[PDB]
Design an enzyme around this catalytic site. Structure first.
Site, PDB file in Angstrom:
ATOM      1  N   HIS A   1       0.809  -1.209   0.000  1.00 12.57           N
ATOM      2  CA  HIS A   1       0.000   0.000   0.000  1.00 12.57           C
ATOM      3  C   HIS A   1       0.854   1.276   0.000  1.00 12.57           C
ATOM      4  O   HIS A   1       0.292   2.377  -0.014  1.00 12.57           O
ATOM      5  CB  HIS A   1      -1.004  -0.003   1.176  1.00 12.57           C
ATOM      6  CG  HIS A   1      -0.414   0.217   2.544  1.00 12.57           C
ATOM      7  ND1 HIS A   1      -0.011  -0.819   3.357  1.00 12.57           N
ATOM      8  CD2 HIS A   1      -0.223   1.349   3.264  1.00 12.57           C
ATOM      9  CE1 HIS A   1       0.433  -0.332   4.503  1.00 12.57           C
ATOM     10  NE2 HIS A   1       0.326   0.981   4.468  1.00 12.57           N
TER      11      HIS A   1
ATOM     12  N   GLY B   1       2.952   5.500   9.862  1.00 10.41           N
ATOM     13  CA  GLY B   1       4.302   5.303   9.421  1.00 10.41           C
ATOM     14  C   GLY B   1       4.925   4.015   9.899  1.00 10.41           C
ATOM     15  O   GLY B   1       6.044   3.697   9.479  1.00 10.41           O
TER      16      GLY B   1
ATOM     17  N   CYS C   1       4.013   0.897   9.411  1.00  6.28           N
ATOM     18  CA  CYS C   1       3.921  -0.209   8.479  1.00  6.28           C
ATOM     19  C   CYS C   1       5.292  -0.574   7.952  1.00  6.28           C
ATOM     20  O   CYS C   1       6.166   0.281   7.801  1.00  6.28           O
ATOM     21  CB  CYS C   1       3.006   0.143   7.324  1.00  6.28           C
ATOM     22  SG  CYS C   1       1.360   0.234   7.859  1.00  6.28           S
TER      23      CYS C   1
HETATM   24  C1  LIG Z   1       0.860   1.868   8.394  1.00  5.41           C
HETATM   25  N1  LIG Z   1       1.666   2.819   8.232  1.00  5.41           N
HETATM   26  C2  LIG Z   1      -0.484   2.029   9.062  1.00  5.41           C
HETATM   27  C3  LIG Z   1      -0.416   1.437  10.485  1.00  5.41           C
HETATM   28  C4  LIG Z   1      -1.608   1.863  11.403  1.00  5.41           C
HETATM   29  C5  LIG Z   1      -1.582   3.572  11.583  1.00  5.41           C
HETATM   30  C6  LIG Z   1      -2.176   3.808  12.700  1.00  5.41           C
HETATM   31  N2  LIG Z   1      -1.836   2.553  13.649  1.00  5.41           N
HETATM   32  C7  LIG Z   1      -1.488   1.377  12.626  1.00  5.41           C
HETATM   33  O1  LIG Z   1      -1.203   0.302  12.971  1.00  5.41           O
HETATM   34  N3  LIG Z   1      -1.469   1.294   8.249  1.00  5.41           N
HETATM   35  C8  LIG Z   1      -2.633   1.947   7.676  1.00  5.41           C
HETATM   36  O2  LIG Z   1      -2.776   3.118   7.845  1.00  5.41           O
HETATM   37  C9  LIG Z   1      -3.668   1.186   6.779  1.00  5.41           C
HETATM   38  C10 LIG Z   1      -3.365   1.567   5.306  1.00  5.41           C
HETATM   39  C11 LIG Z   1      -4.161   0.686   4.212  1.00  5.41           C
HETATM   40  C12 LIG Z   1      -4.232   1.359   2.808  1.00  5.41           C
HETATM   41  C13 LIG Z   1      -3.555  -0.744   4.231  1.00  5.41           C
HETATM   42  N4  LIG Z   1      -5.014   1.556   7.059  1.00  5.41           N
HETATM   43  C14 LIG Z   1      -5.539   1.215   8.383  1.00  5.41           C
HETATM   44  O3  LIG Z   1      -4.789   0.648   9.054  1.00  5.41           O
HETATM   45  C15 LIG Z   1      -6.974   1.449   8.901  1.00  5.41           C
HETATM   46  C16 LIG Z   1      -8.144   1.768   8.225  1.00  5.41           C
HETATM   47  C17 LIG Z   1      -9.208   1.803   9.172  1.00  5.41           C
HETATM   48  C18 LIG Z   1     -10.605   2.088   9.139  1.00  5.41           C
HETATM   49  O4  LIG Z   1     -11.309   2.420   7.927  1.00  5.41           O
HETATM   50  C19 LIG Z   1     -10.654   3.223   6.972  1.00  5.41           C
HETATM   51  C20 LIG Z   1     -11.368   2.009  10.314  1.00  5.41           C
HETATM   52  C21 LIG Z   1     -10.773   1.669  11.544  1.00  5.41           C
HETATM   53  C22 LIG Z   1      -9.415   1.407  11.584  1.00  5.41           C
HETATM   54  C23 LIG Z   1      -8.639   1.478  10.366  1.00  5.41           C
HETATM   55  N5  LIG Z   1      -7.301   1.265  10.157  1.00  5.41           N
END
Ligand SMILES: *C(=N)[C@H](C[C@@H]1CCNC1=O)NC(=O)[C@H](CC(C)C)NC(=O)c1cc2c(OC)cccc2[nH]1
Ligand SMILES: *C(=N)[C@H](C[C@@H]1CCNC1=O)NC(=O)[C@H](CC(C)C)NC(=O)c1cc2c(OC)cccc2[nH]1
Lengths: 306, 306
Positions: free
Chosen positions: A41, A143, A145
């Site tokens: 992603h 960040g 990930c």
């Molecule tokens: C990676 N950088 C990040 C890690 C998350 C950031 C906040 N704590 C984490 O562990 N991953 C993401 O942001 C991920 C990106 C997608 C495109 C794979 N998205 C989410 O992790 C995410 C979406 C979401 C929703 O709906 C949008 C609702 C509740 C929680 C949630 N988390």
């Protein structure tokens, strides 16, 4: 003496972390030999995130759209491919710090160390368990990930986890290093539900054996039970069914402490039924389930690595 | 989101661990520049620990009675001295992996990472607090002496702790890297008492702020209190008194959460008086006091080092 949630020394993995930038988004990747592994992603834009077509977003990109740096060293990208949910970028230089390593798909209830990273630099390490519902209870911010979880067996790093998302309930989800998610999750900005999580019975028992090894013994009793009768009490309190494979795993511990597994099951049964009564075991007011039997044995017998 | 006891990444310290052998006894030392630091009781024989005269045991020893091994490299010892409770072995070659470093005497309530070692090689890392009674609650077996505790600020490792002993109650004691014990302890196999251990009030509040940042909010209440009034509650319940210095340190967190320090003291008072009622805060049934306010901000804002 003493007993702590202990992580593996992270020296061999710190050496493999790099920063990976594609357009606006930056996350972490894992540099081993001449390949950098990172969550796919990294190719999403803030709009295309609600349901991306990754095969068709990867098409808009060439090698030089991918910025990889190890510290201040920029790596040249000479190839890129997608495997499930991870990107693999071939780079011109092989990591001189590459440890001897394996990629391993871990099983529910197994434990591993997480090296939490931001912009390619380590922030901290802690121990984690892959819960039965295929989530982990971690500490991850934006960040993070690309952060990886791992075990170390002597000199060999077993990479088992790469971090991808936070769920609504605040637990975490991710993939093995082949890009296959643990659990039913997908890598898209959607709200996804984990199933209900049972407690890892075999781990709770290995922790009770650690308690006994360390002097904590008030929970021991005169009673007994059978695997099937305890398993009725385990259902009621949301513990995984205990099996004869589990019994066999607790045997070296049973045989170190002179306490047979089913009598320790009987002590546990009565903690589940009456609680702790304000007392503590190994400094915890709760039943701990993120120590495998192996963990207990490493920590009480003193296993090293380098 | 999430909140874990995280250790600093341990890479810079692993590069400094070596084995130190004097006759039968082997333990760990710290190799920095051309000097190896290790506990002086490496020179006792299994009898002499009940009352050693260390100046007179150290006189029977020459350079070549000290075998230093960094991995498989044997280092040549070309000098030796005793500084308080640590030996300093001058070696011919400077550690090529020496990080930027300082030696720091930390204060009660500050935390640090422990890298537990055996035979000069790393076994695991965990986070620890210097209790008010100058002990630490660790996980150390035979051979672990010479394991060091440290913090990392950007690129500089601050060594604060070297491990020397386990007390009767199963807690641990040791020195700064100048060899002065934290607390009233001495390095002899004698019956030694840690004092009464208070709870680190400023840290418990820092953990409550962390809890609120992460969504755990059920302990917040409508009431308030005063500094002198809560301190009456802290005494009865074995907490160190709270000061306006502590208030001042908790202020950036109070200003991030919109909750003033004295309202959060009020939430705590009623946890102290009523218990938790079978509920949990950040996964703990107990009030955690091993996160400093600094630790909370490092982990909630994501600070990195390498
Ligand atoms: C990676 N950088 C990040 C890690 C998350 C950031 C906040 N704590 C984490 O562990 N991953 C993401 O942001 C991920 C990106 C997608 C495109 C794979 N998205 C989410 O992790 C995410 C979406 C979401 C929703 O709906 C949008 C609702 C509740 C929680 C949630 N988390
Ligand atoms: C160092 N390698 C070792 C670490 C101990 C091993 C067991 N758990 C540890 O933390 N230190 C020692 O063995 C130390 C030797 C020196 C300080 C002389 N002795 C002790 O740590 C020790 C002595 C002792 C007594 O004797 C009165 C009673 C209870 C506990 C105890 N611990």
């Amino acid at each position: 003496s003493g007993f702590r949630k202990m992580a593996f020394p992270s020296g061999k993995v710190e050496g493999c972390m790099v920063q990976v930038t594609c357009g606006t988004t930056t996350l972490n990747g894992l540099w081993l030999d001449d390949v950098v592994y990172c969550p796919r992603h990294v190719i999403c834009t803030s709009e295309d995130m609600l349901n991306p077509n990754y095969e068709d977003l990867l098409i808009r990109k060439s090698n030089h759209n991918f910025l990889v740096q190890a510290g201040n060293v920029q790596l040249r990208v000479i190839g890129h491919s997608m495997q499930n949910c991870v990107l693999k970028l071939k780079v011109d230089t092989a990591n001189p710090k590459t440890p001897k390593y394996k990629f391993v798909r871990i099983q529910p209830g197994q434990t591993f160390s997480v090296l939490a990273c931001y912009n390619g630099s380590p922030s901290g390490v802690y121990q984690c368990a892959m819960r039965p519902n295929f989530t982990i209870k971690g500490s991850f911010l934006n960040g993070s990930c690309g952060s990886v979880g791992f075990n170390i067996d002597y000199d060999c790093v077993s990479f088992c986890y790469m971090h991808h998302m936070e769920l609504p309930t605040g637990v975490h989800a991710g993939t093995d290093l082949e890009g296959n998610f643990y659990g039913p999750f997908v890598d898209r900005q959607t709200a996804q539900a984990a199933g209900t999580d049972t407690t890892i019975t075999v781990n709770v028992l290995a922790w009770l054996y650690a308690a006994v090894i360390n002097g904590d013994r008030w929970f021991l009793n005169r009673f007994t039970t059978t695997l099937n009768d305890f398993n009725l009490v385990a259902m009621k309190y949301n513990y995984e069914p205990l099996t004869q494979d589990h019994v066999d795993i607790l045997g070296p511990l049973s045989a170190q402490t002179g306490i047979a597994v089913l009598d320790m099951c009987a002590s546990l049964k009565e903690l589940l039924q009456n609680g702790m009564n304000g007392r503590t075991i190994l400094g915890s007011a709760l039943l701990e389930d993120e120590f495998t039997p192996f963990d207990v044995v490493r920590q009480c017998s003193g296993v090293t690595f380098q």
